[PDB]
Design a binder for these strands. Structure first.
Lengths: 119, 129, 91, 10, 72
RNA sequence: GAUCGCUAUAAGAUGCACGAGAGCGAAAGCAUUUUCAACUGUGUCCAUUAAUCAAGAACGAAAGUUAGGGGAUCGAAGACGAUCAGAUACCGUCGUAGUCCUAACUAUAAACGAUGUCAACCAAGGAUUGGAUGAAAACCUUGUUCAGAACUUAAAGAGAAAUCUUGAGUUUAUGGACUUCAGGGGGAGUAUGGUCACAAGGCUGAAACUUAAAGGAAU
């Protein structure tokens, strides 16, 4: 038997009958609320990271991606009257933009600002 | 050395050549029971058939409820470093087998690695012929 | 002579573009010449969503970009050999 | 003004 | 069109020293610290040929005495 | 005690998604963030200072050479296991040179838009990258006039046709300026000679002899 000599502690985690342990828990489970689901929190016996679902679901095709470093990611968005397919920022407009950060919206319309990772 | 209902994590790594049914504690350091497709079949070509993945995932659960783990944070993954990032055939069978096995299903996530930047890929210029 | 007016690529004002590796074959292929498809799929196949929702949370989706070589695109039915007149159809 | 006509092959 | 680039601009005034300003030649001969900048070296030659074309022109116009020879 | 799971380090290489018939560059080429060129604006200056260019000179993918460092992944050679009549290959595994950086050489590619450079004229459209000037409250919506990469239609023009139209139009109704190249197919980019390189090779480059086709676009 492997598990005969196992003692369960709480954070529960199996430990042989020593805890640099790292435990990851969704922010929803910490907050017991589903509006925070797109966030993974790590605890050591430690930082947060955006879930792979949310990060890959917000990378649009015809916009300029903005990333800086606390890691911050953003996206230029469309305007209400905009009829053209693409909304790209210039080289200079990007350099300015380097949590609601967003209002940089006077430099270019921006909507998708999140902190994908804290180290 | 067992306890009451303890949430597990099921990093179900299934590829086109094999499947893995791996459950640990939430810390990810102590595995509970790990049964793969190649431990349930005799034919090499069937190391990753949906029957093989579901039978392995079946027997995996029985130990989990035996040891007290009843709910699993599923984590889906395929061999996607520089190769195909789509989970293999038996991935859905393994997950569904656990669900039929009367196990609560927590978070489901895709933990296939996505290279920010990559090394070389096998095959040369002209690829596999 | 020229089968296509754009020579099958999509580069106009540039001379050189980086290669990428074919999804299925692993063959090197120029970036503009690649046949790119954006796939979005639920992790939980709809054939098993009932079981998960039975004993369980919004089920997340998959977001991958797949690039093929011309040899694997045709052989994989990603694109078909169109007619001579329909080749100009770009919609 | 030359500019007025300034705001092509051979 | 432009002398060296293929650009064809028509920015002009519309009515209802220059050789000095090209020695730009010194301001890039910068090449001391950046010895690997081949872009600067190619553009150094272009600016130099502008000088020799202007040097040759001003001599025959007697603006410059024909002893002039720009060096480094 | 493999595969696999979490956590840690250290170099090497890489620079996803954003990434587009979008941008820049003479071409080769350029993708993490913190000197040069061009466009536009002008009641600024000079005054033909210009165009194309034998000789001559820069830059020039990849591979390759020499000497160092680096040496993860992949991987000409090679070794295995397959498949096959054989397979000295395609399939799988392992693996030296190389793949990376520095310094010096080599100077060739389907180095292609197979389309030389400069200048005038030439049907009809929507959209696009950077301007400036109006309208509309920097970003988006509209008008105007330039520069740039393109795309759509043509009952027209051209062509052998495919197709081209911002030319491959304004060519027997034959002449805008300049440079380069070609003369049926082979022998042959071979011999000899000359020259450049450490070398592989590069550049210049025949003849003898042989033969009625070779080739292009469309049915």
């Amino acid at each position: 038997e492997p598990f005969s000599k196992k003692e369960w502690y709480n954070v529960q985690i199996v430990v042989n009958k020593q805890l640099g342990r790292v435990v990851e828990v969704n922010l929803a489970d910490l907050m017991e609320n589903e509006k925070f689901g797109a966030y993974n929190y790590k605890f050591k016996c430690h930082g947060l990271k955006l879930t792979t679902d949310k990060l890959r679901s917000i990378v649009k095709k015809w916009c300029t991606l903005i990333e800086t470093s606390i890691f911050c990611i953003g996206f230029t968005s469309r305007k209400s009257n905009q009829i053209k397919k693409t909304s790209y920022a210039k080289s200079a407009q990007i350099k300015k933009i380097r949590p609601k950060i967003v209002a940089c919206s006077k430099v270019f319309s921006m909507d998708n600002v999140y902190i994908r990772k804290v180290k | 050395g067992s306890t009451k209902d303890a949430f597990g994590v099921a990093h179900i790594y299934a590829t086109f050549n094999d499947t893995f049914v791996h459950v640990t504690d939430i810390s990810g350091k102590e595995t509970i029971i790990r049964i793969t497709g190649g431990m349930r079949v005799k034919a090499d070509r069937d190391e990753s058939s949906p029957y093989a993945a579901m039978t392995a995932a079946q027997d995996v659960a029985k130990r989990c409820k035996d040891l007290g783990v009843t709910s699993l944070h599923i984590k889906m993954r395929g061999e996607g470093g520089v190769y195909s990032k789509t989970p293999g055939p038996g991935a859905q069978a393994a997950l569904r087998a656990l669900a039929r096995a009367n196990m609560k299903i927590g978070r489901i996530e895709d933990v296939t690695p996505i290279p920010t930047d990559c090394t070389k890929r096998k095959g040369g210029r002209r690829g596999r012929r | 002579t020229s089968k296509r007016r754009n020579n099958g690529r999509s580069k106009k004002g540039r001379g050189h573009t980086q290669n990428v590796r074919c999804s299925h074959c692993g063959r090197c292929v120029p970036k503009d010449k690649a046949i790119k498809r954006y796939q979005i799929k639920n992790i939980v196949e709809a054939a098993a969503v009932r079981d998960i929702s039975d004993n369980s949370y919004k089920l997340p989706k998959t977001y991958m970009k797949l690039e093929y070589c011309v040899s694997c695109g045709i052989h994989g039915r990603v694109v078909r050999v169109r007619s001579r007149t329909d080749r100009r159809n770009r919609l | 003004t030359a500019a007025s006509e300034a705001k092509n092959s051979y | 069109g432009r002398m060296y680039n293929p650009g064809r601009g028509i920015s002009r005034r519309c009515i209802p020293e220059d050789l000095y300003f090209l020695m730009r030649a010194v301001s890039v001969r910068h090449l001391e610290k950046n010895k690997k900048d081949k872009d600067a070296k190619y553009h150094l030659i272009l600016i130099e040929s502008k000088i020799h074309r202007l040097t040759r022109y001003y001599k025959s116009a007697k603006v410059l005495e024909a002893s002039f020879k720009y060096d480094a």
